[PDB]
Amino acid sequence: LLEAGVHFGHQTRRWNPKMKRYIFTERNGIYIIDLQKTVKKVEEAYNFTKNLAAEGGKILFVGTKKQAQDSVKEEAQRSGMYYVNQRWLGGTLTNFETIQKRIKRLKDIEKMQENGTFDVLPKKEVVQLKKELERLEKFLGGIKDMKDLPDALFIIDPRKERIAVAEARKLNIPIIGIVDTNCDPDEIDVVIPANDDAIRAVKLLTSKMADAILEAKQ
Amino acid sequence: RIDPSKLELEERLVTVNRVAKVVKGGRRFRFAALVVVGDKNGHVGFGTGKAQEVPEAIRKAVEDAKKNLIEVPMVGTTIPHEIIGRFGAGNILLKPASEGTGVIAGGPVRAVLELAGVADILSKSLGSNTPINMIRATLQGLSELKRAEDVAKLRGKSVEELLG
RNA sequence: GGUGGUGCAUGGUUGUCGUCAGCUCGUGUCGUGAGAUGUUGGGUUAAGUCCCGCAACGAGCGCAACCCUUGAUCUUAGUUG
RNA sequence: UUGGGCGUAAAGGGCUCGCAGGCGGUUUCUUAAGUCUGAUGUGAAAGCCCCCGGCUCAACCGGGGAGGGUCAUUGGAAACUGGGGAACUUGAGUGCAGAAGAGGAGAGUGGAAUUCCACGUGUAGCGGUGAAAUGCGUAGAGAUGUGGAGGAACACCAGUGGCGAAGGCGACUCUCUGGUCUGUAACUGACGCUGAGGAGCGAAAGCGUGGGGAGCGAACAGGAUUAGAUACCCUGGUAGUCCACGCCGUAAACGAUGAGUGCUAAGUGUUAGGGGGUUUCCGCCCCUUAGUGCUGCAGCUAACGCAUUAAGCACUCCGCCUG
């Protein structure tokens, strides 16, 4: 059922025959994702994530495309969840201890610039401290209040970004994600076939999941 | 699944290898380690050990041991059937026997089977005499084991029908 | 007691590559393992200087800096000047 | 054998045609050589082994039993294998209709270019190197113009492009001749695969007899180079290469991968087809046989790598290896 869909969406010949049972064929080379199978698989994801919100795995969001930098951040801040619109760091989950040390450095340096000893030099902060502040507010972003190992993750393109999925797979964590047709269904537990770069659809699919956990707050 | 760390690990070592690296000045001698880790109730695992010292390699062996454990069926303190593992040029076969037969195994392999609790194994190191791959020759075969009630559930059949 | 012997028993002490831009560690992975990544790629610098990229994020010893001298000026102090 | 290998570690015969030997599609009847099984006869005793008893226990000795036979006779079993009888057509082959080709052998044909020689024109050098000399030159070289002999090589097309089993074959045309692939269905009814010895082919070198020898060129010679230069360089230079015929029968004769049959994600070009979809088209798209390459999943691998052209998983045959 076309709830608000507009797309069939994406890849030509560079497509995985693991996802053979999912698409149709157009003469244009771009393939047509079956819309009825799309709604049925995301609805069980819409069901189980509400159970996941009742337990304590908050939600993780990661988006590493220029279309993904905006829609993922606004939906995560609508939910108060954890967004990555920048690069992914090698070891955000298994290497959590040096992540928590580094985010501790950001946690108290903001105390220095407004409450702490702000008057040391007029340029010690500029060369070192505020240059640190521009980095970590981007590269460590709004996932900063995590203090936990989460039990879920949402991404946009694992074929672009297998690197983030690896340690999440390696600690037995069921994750969700919109996938491209060339992606890995052996990897992900929750398959969502849709257009990877439709700016409305990536806003649409992140709207349903953020409103899934929004209703699950009671 | 992943075996949890809510167990009683016994963790006695097997070998230590001093392992070099050649720089502008000269060599650099470090140490290698590998420790078979488990209880005596069916959970076996290990990890590598790399450091610049003896005892810190013993420490860091326990980490990947608790990251990677695996479970073995213990039917009558035996392996339930016969199997031959073949990981990486070290072949080590596994044969069950009666309960008086003890643990007849190779050097590093004998420090694996007693860290399963399983006390009835005949085995024979067909392949090479290298300590990492012989332990890889064991658990890969022990991964491919099966349980009596499980395969009857796989076949949709009676468990006693597998015996009679 | 030895300015008797061995600096291929030694402490200690300095030269030397060279004041050269390097040497590793912690965690994470990578590879059956040795090791690899971090340190490599891009742009610069006296410099592993520093930025960007980057399955790595970090930290430590180094570089520089805080130390002296000389180069300007003010305060205070003017004799044996 | 249970209980290895063969890309590079020791190992695929250079490749073929094949007698013997090896192995067999499908359906059905039948037979019982293999196979399965009973019964009987027998494999002495001591010894091993099952269990008792005896010696002060033990060792030893004794009692009883089992076991040991590709054993023979006899009677059963008929799925599979062997044998016989009869059918089916996918394997393989034949017809027919196409298409591709540097496949072979033969006699002949040219076109640039090298040199040689004849001559005009024309003067001091060209020739050659890291540098330079030897060689060539006032007897007229080199350069240049026409003409002549003669050989061998066949640009451009040229391309992980064609074809052959391999070595190999590129000017052109003719004569003669091999296989290849598609299209089905007309036919045969398993006629097939592999193959020790045996047979034939097999670049270059070399050999024997004559032919022919323009370049090129081992041996040698000369000039340098160098402490030495029996070498790289240098100008010449014999055999050779070349042809017909005969022989040697080896090579990194390489995909460092023995031949065949099936099966196991893709994506991608590219050579020859064929089928279709709108279209006479051109074309695009899709399906599909065949070699031809690259990047890739599972799995295999000691790692590099290999991956529907396997080194994946299986099977039949032949060779080879055991530091």
Short mmCIF file of N, CA and C in Angstrom, two decimals, chain B residues 59-157:
data_model
loop_
_atom_site.label_atom_id
_atom_site.label_comp_id
_atom_site.label_asym_id
_atom_site.label_seq_id
_atom_site.Cartn_x
_atom_site.Cartn_y
_atom_site.Cartn_z
N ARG B 59 47.41 -11.87 30.67
CA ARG B 59 46.21 -11.08 30.93
C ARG B 59 45.36 -10.94 29.69
N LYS B 60 45.97 -10.53 28.58
CA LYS B 60 45.22 -10.21 27.38
C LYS B 60 44.77 -11.44 26.62
N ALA B 61 45.24 -12.63 27.00
CA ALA B 61 44.66 -13.86 26.48
C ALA B 61 43.24 -14.03 26.98
N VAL B 62 42.97 -13.59 28.21
CA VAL B 62 41.68 -13.84 28.85
C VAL B 62 40.59 -12.97 28.22
N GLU B 63 40.96 -11.82 27.65
CA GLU B 63 39.99 -10.92 27.04
C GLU B 63 39.29 -11.56 25.86
N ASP B 64 40.05 -11.97 24.84
CA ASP B 64 39.45 -12.58 23.65
C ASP B 64 38.92 -13.97 23.95
N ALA B 65 39.43 -14.60 25.02
CA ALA B 65 38.79 -15.79 25.54
C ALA B 65 37.36 -15.51 25.98
N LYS B 66 37.16 -14.44 26.73
CA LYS B 66 35.81 -14.06 27.11
C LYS B 66 35.05 -13.40 25.97
N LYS B 67 35.73 -13.02 24.89
CA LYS B 67 35.03 -12.57 23.69
C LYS B 67 34.59 -13.74 22.82
N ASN B 68 35.33 -14.85 22.86
CA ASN B 68 35.06 -15.99 22.00
C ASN B 68 35.12 -17.27 22.84
N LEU B 69 33.96 -17.79 23.20
CA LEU B 69 33.81 -19.11 23.78
C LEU B 69 32.91 -19.93 22.87
N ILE B 70 32.88 -21.24 23.10
CA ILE B 70 32.04 -22.13 22.32
C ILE B 70 31.68 -23.32 23.20
N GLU B 71 30.57 -23.96 22.87
CA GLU B 71 29.96 -24.95 23.74
C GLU B 71 30.03 -26.32 23.07
N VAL B 72 30.21 -27.35 23.89
CA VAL B 72 30.38 -28.72 23.40
C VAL B 72 29.30 -29.61 24.02
N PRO B 73 28.71 -30.53 23.28
CA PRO B 73 27.80 -31.50 23.91
C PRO B 73 28.55 -32.54 24.72
N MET B 74 27.99 -32.87 25.88
CA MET B 74 28.65 -33.72 26.87
C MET B 74 27.85 -34.99 27.14
N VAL B 75 27.46 -35.70 26.08
CA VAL B 75 26.62 -36.88 26.21
C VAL B 75 27.43 -37.99 26.88
N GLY B 76 27.11 -38.26 28.15
CA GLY B 76 27.77 -39.32 28.90
C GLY B 76 29.24 -39.09 29.16
N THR B 77 29.64 -37.83 29.35
CA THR B 77 31.04 -37.37 29.44
C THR B 77 31.87 -37.82 28.24
N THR B 78 31.24 -37.94 27.08
CA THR B 78 31.89 -38.26 25.83
C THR B 78 31.56 -37.18 24.81
N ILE B 79 32.15 -37.31 23.63
CA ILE B 79 31.59 -36.67 22.45
C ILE B 79 30.51 -37.62 21.96
N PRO B 80 29.38 -37.12 21.45
CA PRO B 80 28.26 -38.03 21.15
C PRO B 80 28.47 -38.90 19.93
N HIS B 81 29.42 -38.56 19.07
CA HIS B 81 29.65 -39.31 17.85
C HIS B 81 31.07 -39.07 17.39
N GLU B 82 31.37 -39.51 16.17
CA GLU B 82 32.71 -39.42 15.62
C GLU B 82 32.77 -38.32 14.58
N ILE B 83 33.88 -37.58 14.57
CA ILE B 83 34.02 -36.41 13.70
C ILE B 83 35.51 -36.20 13.41
N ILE B 84 35.80 -35.54 12.29
CA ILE B 84 37.17 -35.22 11.87
C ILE B 84 37.19 -33.76 11.45
N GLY B 85 37.88 -32.92 12.22
CA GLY B 85 38.02 -31.51 11.87
C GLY B 85 39.23 -31.28 10.98
N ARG B 86 39.13 -30.28 10.10
CA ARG B 86 40.13 -30.09 9.05
C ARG B 86 40.50 -28.63 8.84
N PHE B 87 40.67 -27.86 9.90
CA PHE B 87 40.96 -26.44 9.72
C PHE B 87 42.45 -26.21 9.55
N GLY B 88 42.85 -25.81 8.34
CA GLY B 88 44.17 -25.26 8.08
C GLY B 88 45.35 -26.17 8.34
N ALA B 89 45.44 -27.26 7.57
CA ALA B 89 46.59 -28.15 7.46
C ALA B 89 46.91 -28.94 8.73
N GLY B 90 46.20 -28.67 9.82
CA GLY B 90 46.27 -29.52 10.98
C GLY B 90 44.99 -30.30 11.08
N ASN B 91 45.02 -31.57 10.71
CA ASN B 91 43.87 -32.43 10.90
C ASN B 91 43.97 -33.06 12.28
N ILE B 92 42.92 -32.91 13.07
CA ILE B 92 42.77 -33.67 14.30
C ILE B 92 41.39 -34.28 14.32
N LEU B 93 41.34 -35.60 14.31
CA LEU B 93 40.09 -36.33 14.38
C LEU B 93 39.68 -36.51 15.84
N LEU B 94 38.42 -36.86 16.03
CA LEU B 94 37.86 -37.04 17.36
C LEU B 94 37.03 -38.31 17.37
N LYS B 95 37.36 -39.23 18.27
CA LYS B 95 36.61 -40.45 18.41
C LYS B 95 36.09 -40.62 19.83
N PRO B 96 34.81 -40.96 19.98
CA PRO B 96 34.29 -41.31 21.30
C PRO B 96 34.70 -42.72 21.68
N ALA B 97 34.58 -43.01 22.97
CA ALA B 97 34.90 -44.33 23.49
C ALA B 97 34.10 -44.55 24.76
N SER B 98 34.41 -45.63 25.47
CA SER B 98 33.74 -45.91 26.73
C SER B 98 34.30 -45.01 27.82
N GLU B 99 33.69 -45.07 29.00
CA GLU B 99 33.99 -44.08 30.03
C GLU B 99 35.29 -44.35 30.78
N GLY B 100 35.86 -45.54 30.68
CA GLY B 100 37.12 -45.76 31.33
C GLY B 100 38.34 -45.34 30.54
N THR B 101 38.16 -44.80 29.34
CA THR B 101 39.26 -44.68 28.39
C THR B 101 40.13 -43.46 28.60
N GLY B 102 39.74 -42.53 29.47
CA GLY B 102 40.60 -41.41 29.76
C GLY B 102 40.71 -40.42 28.61
N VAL B 103 41.70 -39.55 28.72
CA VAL B 103 41.93 -38.48 27.75
C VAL B 103 43.26 -38.76 27.08
N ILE B 104 43.22 -39.40 25.91
CA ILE B 104 44.41 -39.64 25.11
C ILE B 104 44.37 -38.63 23.97
N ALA B 105 45.22 -37.61 24.06
CA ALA B 105 45.24 -36.55 23.08
C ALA B 105 46.64 -35.98 23.01
N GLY B 106 46.85 -35.08 22.06
CA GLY B 106 48.12 -34.40 21.94
C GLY B 106 48.35 -33.41 23.06
N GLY B 107 49.58 -32.89 23.09
CA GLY B 107 50.05 -31.97 24.11
C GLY B 107 49.17 -30.77 24.42
N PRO B 108 48.96 -29.88 23.44
CA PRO B 108 48.03 -28.77 23.67
C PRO B 108 46.57 -29.20 23.67
N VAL B 109 46.27 -30.29 22.97
CA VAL B 109 44.89 -30.75 22.88
C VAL B 109 44.42 -31.31 24.21
N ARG B 110 45.34 -31.92 24.98
CA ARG B 110 45.00 -32.43 26.30
C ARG B 110 44.67 -31.31 27.28
N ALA B 111 45.23 -30.12 27.07
CA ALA B 111 44.80 -28.97 27.85
C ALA B 111 43.58 -28.28 27.26
N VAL B 112 42.86 -28.93 26.35
CA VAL B 112 41.57 -28.42 25.89
C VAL B 112 40.43 -29.27 26.41
N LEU B 113 40.58 -30.59 26.29
CA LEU B 113 39.48 -31.51 26.58
C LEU B 113 39.19 -31.58 28.07
N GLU B 114 40.22 -31.47 28.91
CA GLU B 114 39.99 -31.35 30.34
C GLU B 114 39.39 -30.01 30.71
N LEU B 115 39.57 -28.99 29.88
CA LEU B 115 38.85 -27.74 30.04
C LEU B 115 37.52 -27.74 29.32
N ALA B 116 37.02 -28.92 28.96
CA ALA B 116 35.62 -29.10 28.63
C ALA B 116 34.85 -29.81 29.72
N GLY B 117 35.54 -30.55 30.58
CA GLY B 117 34.92 -31.52 31.45
C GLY B 117 34.74 -32.88 30.82
N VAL B 118 34.86 -32.98 29.50
CA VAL B 118 34.68 -34.25 28.80
C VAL B 118 35.96 -35.05 28.95
N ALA B 119 35.84 -36.26 29.49
CA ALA B 119 37.00 -37.04 29.90
C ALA B 119 37.20 -38.30 29.06
N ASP B 120 36.48 -38.47 27.95
CA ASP B 120 36.53 -39.70 27.16
C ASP B 120 36.73 -39.35 25.69
N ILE B 121 37.98 -39.16 25.26
CA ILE B 121 38.27 -38.82 23.87
C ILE B 121 39.50 -39.59 23.43
N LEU B 122 39.39 -40.29 22.31
CA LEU B 122 40.55 -40.73 21.56
C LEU B 122 40.78 -39.76 20.41
N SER B 123 42.03 -39.38 20.19
CA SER B 123 42.36 -38.46 19.11
C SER B 123 43.78 -38.71 18.65
N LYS B 124 44.15 -38.06 17.55
CA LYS B 124 45.45 -38.29 16.92
C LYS B 124 45.74 -37.11 16.01
N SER B 125 46.81 -36.38 16.29
CA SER B 125 47.14 -35.18 15.51
C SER B 125 47.69 -35.61 14.16
N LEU B 126 46.83 -35.62 13.14
CA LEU B 126 47.28 -35.98 11.80
C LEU B 126 48.18 -34.91 11.21
N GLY B 127 47.78 -33.65 11.35
CA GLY B 127 48.44 -32.54 10.69
C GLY B 127 49.68 -32.07 11.40
N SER B 128 49.92 -30.77 11.34
CA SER B 128 51.18 -30.23 11.80
C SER B 128 51.21 -30.13 13.32
N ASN B 129 52.42 -29.94 13.83
CA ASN B 129 52.65 -29.77 15.26
C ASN B 129 52.85 -28.29 15.58
N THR B 130 51.77 -27.52 15.41
CA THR B 130 51.79 -26.11 15.76
C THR B 130 50.64 -25.80 16.71
N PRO B 131 50.90 -25.04 17.77
CA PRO B 131 49.95 -25.01 18.89
C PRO B 131 48.68 -24.24 18.61
N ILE B 132 48.72 -23.20 17.78
CA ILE B 132 47.51 -22.44 17.49
C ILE B 132 46.58 -23.26 16.61
N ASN B 133 47.13 -23.89 15.58
CA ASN B 133 46.28 -24.55 14.60
C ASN B 133 45.77 -25.89 15.09
N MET B 134 46.48 -26.54 16.02
CA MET B 134 45.93 -27.75 16.61
C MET B 134 44.73 -27.43 17.49
N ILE B 135 44.76 -26.29 18.17
CA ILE B 135 43.58 -25.90 18.94
C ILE B 135 42.48 -25.45 18.00
N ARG B 136 42.84 -24.80 16.90
CA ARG B 136 41.89 -24.56 15.82
C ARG B 136 41.42 -25.85 15.16
N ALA B 137 42.20 -26.92 15.23
CA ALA B 137 41.73 -28.19 14.71
C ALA B 137 40.72 -28.85 15.62
N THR B 138 40.66 -28.45 16.89
CA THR B 138 39.74 -29.07 17.83
C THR B 138 38.38 -28.39 17.83
N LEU B 139 38.36 -27.08 18.09
CA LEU B 139 37.10 -26.38 18.30
C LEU B 139 36.28 -26.29 17.03
N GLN B 140 36.94 -26.25 15.87
CA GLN B 140 36.22 -26.28 14.60
C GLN B 140 35.49 -27.59 14.41
N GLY B 141 36.11 -28.70 14.81
CA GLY B 141 35.40 -29.97 14.83
C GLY B 141 34.36 -30.01 15.94
N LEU B 142 34.69 -29.43 17.10
CA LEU B 142 33.73 -29.41 18.20
C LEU B 142 32.56 -28.48 17.91
N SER B 143 32.77 -27.48 17.05
CA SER B 143 31.65 -26.65 16.61
C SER B 143 30.67 -27.46 15.77
N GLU B 144 31.17 -28.37 14.95
CA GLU B 144 30.33 -29.16 14.06
C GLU B 144 29.71 -30.37 14.73
N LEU B 145 29.69 -30.43 16.06
CA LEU B 145 29.01 -31.53 16.71
C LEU B 145 27.51 -31.30 16.70
N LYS B 146 26.78 -32.34 17.09
CA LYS B 146 25.33 -32.33 17.09
C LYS B 146 24.84 -33.05 18.34
N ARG B 147 23.63 -32.72 18.77
CA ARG B 147 23.03 -33.36 19.93
C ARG B 147 21.99 -34.37 19.48
N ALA B 148 21.75 -35.36 20.34
CA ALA B 148 20.84 -36.44 20.00
C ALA B 148 19.40 -35.96 19.93
N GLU B 149 18.96 -35.18 20.92
CA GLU B 149 17.61 -34.65 20.89
C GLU B 149 17.44 -33.53 19.88
N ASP B 150 18.54 -32.93 19.42
CA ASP B 150 18.44 -31.79 18.52
C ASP B 150 18.18 -32.24 17.08
N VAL B 151 18.87 -33.28 16.62
CA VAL B 151 18.74 -33.70 15.23
C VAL B 151 17.41 -34.41 15.01
N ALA B 152 16.89 -35.07 16.04
CA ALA B 152 15.53 -35.59 15.98
C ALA B 152 14.52 -34.46 15.85
N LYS B 153 14.79 -33.33 16.51
CA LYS B 153 13.99 -32.13 16.28
C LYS B 153 14.26 -31.55 14.90
N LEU B 154 15.49 -31.70 14.39
CA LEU B 154 15.77 -31.29 13.02
C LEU B 154 15.06 -32.18 12.02
N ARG B 155 15.08 -33.49 12.24
CA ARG B 155 14.39 -34.40 11.34
C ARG B 155 12.89 -34.43 11.57
N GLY B 156 12.41 -33.89 12.68
CA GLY B 156 11.02 -34.07 13.04
C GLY B 156 10.72 -35.50 13.42
N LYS B 157 11.62 -36.13 14.16
CA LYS B 157 11.60 -37.57 14.39
C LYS B 157 11.75 -37.81 15.89
#
